[PDB]
Amino acid sequence: ICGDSTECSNLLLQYGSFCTQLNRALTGIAVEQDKNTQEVFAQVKQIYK
Amino acid sequence: ICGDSTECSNLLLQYGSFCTQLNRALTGIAVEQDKNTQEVFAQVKQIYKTPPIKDFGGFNFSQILPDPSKPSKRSFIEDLLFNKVT
Amino acid sequence: GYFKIYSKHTPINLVRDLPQGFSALEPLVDLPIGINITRFQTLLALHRSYLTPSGWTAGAAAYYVGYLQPRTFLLKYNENGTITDAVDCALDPLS
Amino acid sequence: ETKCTLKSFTVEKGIYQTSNFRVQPTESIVRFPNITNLCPFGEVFNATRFASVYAWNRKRISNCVADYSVLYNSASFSTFKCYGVSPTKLNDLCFTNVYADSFVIRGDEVRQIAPGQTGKIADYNYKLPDDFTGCVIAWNSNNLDSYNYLYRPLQSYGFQPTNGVGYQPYRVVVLSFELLHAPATVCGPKKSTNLVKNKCVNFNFNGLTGTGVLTESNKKFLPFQQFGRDIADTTDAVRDPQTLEILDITPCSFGGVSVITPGTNTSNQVAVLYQDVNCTEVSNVFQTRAGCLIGAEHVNNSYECDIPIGAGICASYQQS
Amino acid sequence: NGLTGTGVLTESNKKFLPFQQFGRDIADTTDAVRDPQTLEILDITPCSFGGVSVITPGTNTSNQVAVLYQDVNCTEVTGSNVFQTRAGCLIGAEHVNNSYECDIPIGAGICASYQTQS
Amino acid sequence: YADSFVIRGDEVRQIAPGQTGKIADYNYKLPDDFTGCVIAWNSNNL
Amino acid sequence: QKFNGLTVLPPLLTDEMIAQYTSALLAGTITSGWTFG
Amino acid sequence: SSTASALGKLQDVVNQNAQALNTLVKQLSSNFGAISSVLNDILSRLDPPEAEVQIDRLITGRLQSLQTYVTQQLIRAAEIRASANLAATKMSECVLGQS
Amino acid sequence: EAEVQIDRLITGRLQSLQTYVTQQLIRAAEIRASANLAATKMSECVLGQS
Amino acid sequence: QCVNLTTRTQLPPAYTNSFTRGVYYPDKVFRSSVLHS
Ligand SMILES: *[C@@H]1O[C@H](CO)[C@@H](O[C@@H]2O[C@H](CO)[C@@H](O)[C@H](O)[C@H]2NC(C)=O)[C@H](O)[C@H]1NC(C)=O
Ligand SMILES: *[C@@H]1O[C@H](CO)[C@@H](O[C@@H]2O[C@H](CO)[C@@H](O)[C@H](O)[C@H]2NC(C)=O)[C@H](O)[C@H]1NC(C)=O
Ligand SMILES: *[C@@H]1O[C@H](CO)[C@@H](O)[C@H](O)[C@H]1NC(C)=O
Ligand SMILES: *[C@@H]1O[C@H](CO)[C@@H](O)[C@H](O)[C@H]1NC(C)=O
Ligand SMILES: *[C@@H]1O[C@H](CO)[C@@H](O)[C@H](O)[C@H]1NC(C)=O
Ligand SMILES: *[C@@H]1O[C@H](CO)[C@@H](O)[C@H](O)[C@H]1NC(C)=O
Ligand SMILES: *[C@@H]1O[C@H](CO)[C@@H](O)[C@H](O)[C@H]1NC(C)=O
Ligand SMILES: *[C@@H]1O[C@H](CO)[C@@H](O)[C@H](O)[C@H]1NC(C)=O
Ligand SMILES: *[C@@H]1O[C@H](CO)[C@@H](O)[C@H](O)[C@H]1NC(C)=O
Ligand SMILES: *[C@@H]1O[C@H](CO)[C@@H](O)[C@H](O)[C@H]1NC(C)=O
Ligand SMILES: *[C@@H]1O[C@H](CO)[C@@H](O)[C@H](O)[C@H]1NC(C)=O
Ligand SMILES: *[C@@H]1O[C@H](CO)[C@@H](O)[C@H](O)[C@H]1NC(C)=O
């Protein structure tokens, strides 16, 4: 939004924790993509030859 | 958003039906929460009971069967579960 | 355009320097002044010497001075109301 | 209400949330600290010798909550005229400083003080700007005055005991304030009332304007703190600024209301559910976990659920 | 000429046509500029940024920390055995040749753990 | 609706929607929205 | 791609580790049938 | 009874709902560009021409915080309904049968 | 006067970022449905016979 | 009055390191068992 400009960054603090909520949402769907692969492929105890 | 303020409530009518929609959406997912529990647990027609003498071949179900001297008549394992979720 | 003073009196048993605990400096006064301040000093109470061979200079004294700065400090309040543990944010990465 | 909400003339069976319910507050209260100061005003009006305009002195008044109605609503001071802000609105406001001039002019030259006309006493003795000097206060006097006060060219004044009107020896005291730039210092008397408890009131505890009930608290502040705050920043406890007593603030009850229709091809009977509220404070009246239910009789049977209320309680049209 | 901004400047192997004053790719931000005096063409790529992550074993266990600087070749950032990986670079962690079950996922195949002893 | 009255030239700014003062608050109050026009001219001759 | 605020994080299992998983699944269903599950 | 956080799937649903309801109330102390975040203090300190301009900054900010909450509860409830359709299939096919 | 112009850019950019994040939550719930089917198809068809 | 005095000595102002000192109550609000930032 602001991009290295401290006049904008103080005006953005009047909007509460919107940015905080936005970062918390995109991290929850990044951790989820690693669990999506762990459930499909890691279905084996040992490595068979 | 207004909280007992008449000149705030007058300005909010300029937005139309933004808040008839939000109460309708939150009521649609509160009725759904009751349909969720009904479909899991109401799978049985009659309320069956276990016989008072328990000759199950040597198998022991006393920790998963209910307890008649207890709050809510929960089982033993059902009380360890309810004393761990805040 | 204000002037706020915060204070505390604490018993101590260390040899010279600052102890390790926490101090809740509660405010004394606030003075509606509006004066523009940029330099200061401290007052000593020297007494007259008399028939003992200028004639001044009581005792021995020392004080510690250190200047604010802005950061963020988090207070883990008590059930009484008291600030007990203070957290500094820009101290280290762990903070 | 339900038909209006659904915009239809026929409703089907169900339970519909149709409006809200709140207890409206009565008899607002305000509670402010105390008035300890009286203000230095003993040293302006009861002083013996007052000067003239050739040596107009000034007296700064600061750091008080003074008054402005014990010299306006009382009327023995012959001159109470000033402009712009009416003297009924000085008690609710205040600047930074208060200054007091004093001079004694006969009555024929008293009339030239109305800013927009600088006087002979005001062009060469006391500088009157284009803005109005705050107030000019004068009263007739014959105790220690009714001669030896000059002004300005240099001429003396004529004072005696048998001098016709217009020449009276008034006592002109001029009040003016400071730019009030920095934090002010001198307001009027603040205002308090008598507090109530245990009913929904509209309160003001030295700044906190909200609504709620005020019950007595058993909590302990630190001796410098004024109010408490919950998590997510809501004021729950305040301190009574006259009695130093901690009072809890809980919001006076709100909720939703809902109507239980068996449908309008069956009946026009209705039960009403006031959600999570005690019927004690606004057919039979039945108290439930879901709020109390008014218009439905609590039978002691068990059937299948037809219209759900909550926490295990249901309802359906049986002739009631 | 008033086109204020921040970044590093390097010599551009791209060319202009002599009527062109600056350049851009996408989203109105300028990439190249012809300076008013030398009339040389210079690239504007911004000086590096990233995110900072911090790996902890739990305060109940210890008070020690490694720090991950995400997506930055750390010749431009302590000093406790830095280790460049694909997911950034680690500062304060000891690279070993063993292999265990994953404890704390760093990324791109690397995990981190606290065992005997830093 | 044509409404006419005589006012000081200082107070020709006082006849406006959302205005406070002496004449706008104690003599003649235009409402807040006020679809309309305000016409004025000098009368030193009369 | 990184332009301005935008980042792409790397996945925790690389493409070599995922291919080593599907080779151990395929070496058990040839050798052992359905007994390894 | 010895090992806690074995119910970690059920604790995360209770924690996430409380996190979202805590953030709805803390957005009431935001200005959103007005002069004060309390609706009674721009009332007691401004005239109804200028108070209408500041209240319309609080309304637009508080209405956006309530629409963000309802949208995130609509997405989150679609994930619970997927998990309750799975527990209703596991009760048919594995409690009342043998799979 | 810069503040009343910056605020027009803030509310427009904060709305373009929310429209992104809302549509990424809806899209990531479609992948989780399809990565749950791929997990069932490996349990019930690679590790067994269906 | 104004009897000047000072001499000259002073050496290097001895430095030190306060660990955790100087936390004043920045308010009047009363919070109960709740970490506040
Ligand atoms: C079935 O299992 C229960 C375990 O839950 C047994 O109950 C325990 O028995 C021991 C005796 O070996 C007692 O010391 C415990 O106090 C019992 N726990 C209870 C009653 O909660 C029970 O004995 C078993 N029943 C049979 C028939 O073997
Ligand atoms: C407060 O007083 C100081 C004077 O000590 C002002 O600060 C600066 O003082 C230096 C001399 O040391 C001058 O050369 C500068 O010009 C002063 N600063 C400025 C901005 O003029 C300071 O300005 C004063 N503060 C106020 C509000 O007047
Ligand atoms: C002193 O002056 C005040 C004016 O405020 C007046 O009310 C009061 O009566 C005076 N005192 C006496 C003893 O006359
Ligand atoms: C305030 O004044 C009242 C008298 O009206 C007195 O009873 C009370 O103790 C006073 N409190 C303080 C804090 O001065
Ligand atoms: C309910 O209404 C329909 C028409 O609206 C009617 O046909 C039906 O008979 C009604 N039910 C009863 C029990 O009368
Ligand atoms: C409901 O309120 C009344 C009023 O005081 C009280 O007597 C009663 O105990 C309350 N009931 C419950 C269940 O709290
Ligand atoms: C239903 O229960 C109540 C319990 O308070 C009991 O008093 C009442 O008699 C019961 N109803 C009938 C019809 O007996
Ligand atoms: C400007 O001056 C510099 C050296 O001072 C040199 O490039 C040249 O003389 C001028 N460049 C122009 C006019 O583009
Ligand atoms: C520390 O962690 C262990 C396991 O990680 C746990 O059992 C213990 O309760 C924790 N706290 C203390 C004080 O040891
Ligand atoms: C990191 O920097 C070094 C020298 O600064 C360079 O040799 C190396 O190729 C760089 N790594 C990457 C991935 O660019
Ligand atoms: C770890 O492996 C690298 C690469 O094979 C090697 O250079 C290094 O010596 C090894 N470390 C130890 C302790 O053997
Ligand atoms: C000492 O103080 C006097 C004034 O009393 C002054 O003239 C003189 O320069 C000072 N000397 C020193 C070393 O301070």
Give me the DSSP letters along I14-44. Answer: HHHHHHHHHHHHHHHHHHHHHHHHHHHHHHT
Which ligand 3 atom sits closest to the C-alpha of D70? 5
Count Cα neighbours of E23 within 13 Å in the Cβ-side half-sphere.
Answer: 16
Q: Check if D202 contacts B (Cβ < 8 Å).
A: no
Q: Are H70 and H24 in contact (CB under 8 A)?
A: no
Q: Check if H19 contacts D (Cβ < 8 Å).
A: no
Instruction: Calculate how close chain D gets to B74, using CA atoms only, in Å.
Output: 18
Catalogue the long-range contacts made by D308-311 (C-beta closer than 8 Å, 24 or more residues apart).
D308/B34, D308/D15, D309/D15, D309/D260, D309/D273
Phi, psi of E53 (to 5 degrees): -115, 155
Catalogue the long-range contacts made by D81-90 (C-beta closer than 8 Å, 24 or more residues apart).
D81/D114, D81/D135, D81/D136, D82/D132, D82/D134, D82/D135, D82/D136, D82/D175, D83/D115, D83/D132, D84/D132, D87/D135, D90/D188
Mutate to test the interface with A, among H68, H70, H76 (most CBs of A within 10 A): H68
Strands D135-138 and D79-81: antiparallel
**Whole-number Å distance between alpha carbons of E112 and E100:** 10
- Those residues whose C-beta lies under 8 Å from the C-beta of residue E56, and which sit 6 or more positions away, are C94, E64, E65
Candidates D265, D259, D235; CA nearest to D307 is: D259
User: Ligand 6 pocket, D278 CB below 6 A?
Assistant: yes
**Whole-number Å distance between alpha carbons of D260 and B30:** 18
Instruction: Calculate how close chain I gets to A12, using CA atoms only, in Å.
Output: 8
The two structure tokens encoding residue D92:
């609710």
**Whole-number Å distance between alpha carbons of D136 and D81:** 6
Q: Are E113 and E105 in contact (CB under 8 A)?
A: no
Strand order in C4-7's β-sheet?
C4-7, C24-30, J23-24
Candidates H82, H75, A32, A25; CA nearest to I31 is: A32
Number of neighbours of residue D96 by Cβ within 10 angstroms: 17
Give Rg (Cα) of chain A: 20
Candidates D257, D271, D310; CA nearest to D13 is: D271
Angle between helices H48-90 and I3-43 in degrees, nearest 10: 0
Strand order in E8-11's β-sheet?
E8-11, E41-45, E30-34, E22-24
From the list H22, H40, H41, the residue facing D232 with the nearest CB is: H22
CA distances from D48 to D45, D125, D143, D175, D261 (A): 9, 22, 9, 18, 85
Burial of D71 per CB tally in 10 Å (0-12, 13-18, 19+): buried
**Whole-number Å distance between alpha carbons of D212 and C81:** 24
Q: Do H78 and I33 touch (CB under 8 A)?
A: no
User: Ligand 4 pocket, D242 CB below 6 A?
Assistant: yes
Q: DSSP secondary-structure letter at B46? A: S
